[PDB]
């Protein structure tokens, strides 16, 4: 109800959004929810390849195909958007150690830099629970490092999300949750919420947050807060 | 290619199929793949509630809404199908201990009994890795018990599938796999396949198996075999 009011006010602001990582599993859910909620008057995807869609609402989605190795040459793709969401990410297994840093730190930071120069007022970064630039684990070290480097850009509003392992298709209430929980010991039915979170809940938290009036310059939501806001 | 030949031969046999648990996550993927592959000339869902669908192919799907507490009164719903798939299942958290036994053992066994009496020649049961009727863990004890009780019905062909924890949306190649694997230690990139499996792979294994000519009266596929056959 109050949230409904915030969404209406937000739609009246005629805001545009750009998304990095829309082809990914979190990104595709974010795009779908953005279209289902009709929060933005213009939606632009920025990525390495053109995507093909099903439903009709996708017909109005703009796509900017870029070469991340020469991103500066595609600076125009980052011009004029009010809000940005970054769901890009790879793994060491798929890209090697250096390739992982290249995507999760370099491409993300460069994109953020171009977005700031392009007028973006609210940048949203999908990070991970445990992000720590001092970590000895490459994945968490890089997440902590890129969080800090994007903070330095000083967006009017910067939101960092640190979800636990991403679930899908109600895994949290299906038999697999019982099997995993039992493997770890005699635990309470709410144990899973501490280390995991459904991707739809993460997206709902991101969009419920986007319609709240800007307050603090930097917001960082840990897994519990994501569960609470993504209700 | 050889598999393509088996599928063609199977379609020429004009077989009908019934599915229990089509509303579930594995069941819905099984139904979708059955329609996409066009393996059966008649598809019937048996369950506690009527389901509503999207795509056109679902228009020919028959639905039998039954009361599992009085299943004998719905014996006609099990009449005449050649193949049956059971993807029913609940949890202790959702149904309590007795309620879990009621669904996973009682409803499943009763359904199998009615299917056998109804002429079903090939019954497929979705069980779990670790199923053991002697287990001290309720979930695995019940899975092991119902596997044995259905074996006693002596279907012409009985296939039991024991998948590890069910994944979805490429979780096996996304960052969550790296996080979970690292939590467990320094492990090889193929570690996850030993304890988990994508639901689509499970369904593909089930359907690749269904088109193979009957050989042994009972077949039991463990997680590795499911990964291999569900390629
Ligand atoms: N999955 C999980 O459990 C968790 C994930 N995270 C974080 O959330 C974010 C999203 O994760 P998730 O949705 O699972 O990721 P996915 O693997 O589903 O999506 C990854 C995205 O990044 C893009 N990408 C990857 N490599 C490149 C590249 N070399 N060049 C250009 N684009 C690239 C992909 O594009 P393309 O389709 O072209 O490859 C895709 O859009 C990541 O930053 C991840 O670290 C946080 C907590 C847990
Ligand atoms: N998820 C996992 O990781 C694993 C699952 N398994 C096994 O695979 C099977 C399928 O699992 P999964 O797809 O995740 O399950 P889901 O929870 O997605 O689906 C469960 C199904 O059982 C039906 N069901 C549950 N309770 C009742 C009831 N009281 N009366 C009638 N129908 C009921 C559901 O119907 P409705 O929609 O009406 O509730 C639904 O069709 C289960 O037997 C599970 O134990 C095996 C290995 C791991």
For the secondary structure, the number of strands of chain A is: 9
Supply the CATH superfamily name of chain A: NAD(P)-binding Rossmann-like Domain
| Spatial shape of chain A | globular
Structural class of chain A: alpha/beta
Helix content of chain A: 40-55%
What ions, cofactors and ligands are bound?
A: NADPH dihydro-nicotinamide-adenine-dinucleotide phosphate
- Count structural domains of chain A: 1
Strand order of the largest sheet of chain A: 3-2-1-4-5-6-9
Q: What name does CATH use for the topology of chain A?
A: Rossmann fold
Largest interface: A-B, 29 and 29 residues
Rg of chain A, Cα atoms, Å: 18 Å
Terminal-residue CA separation of chain A: 14 Å
Oligomeric form = homodimer
Order of helices and strands of chain A: HEHEEEHEHEEHEHEH
Assign the CATH class of chain A: Alpha Beta
How many H/I helices of chain A?
7
PDB class: transcription
Keywords: CC3, TIP30, PEG600, transcription
Assembly: dimeric
Entry title: CC3(TIP30)Crystal Structure
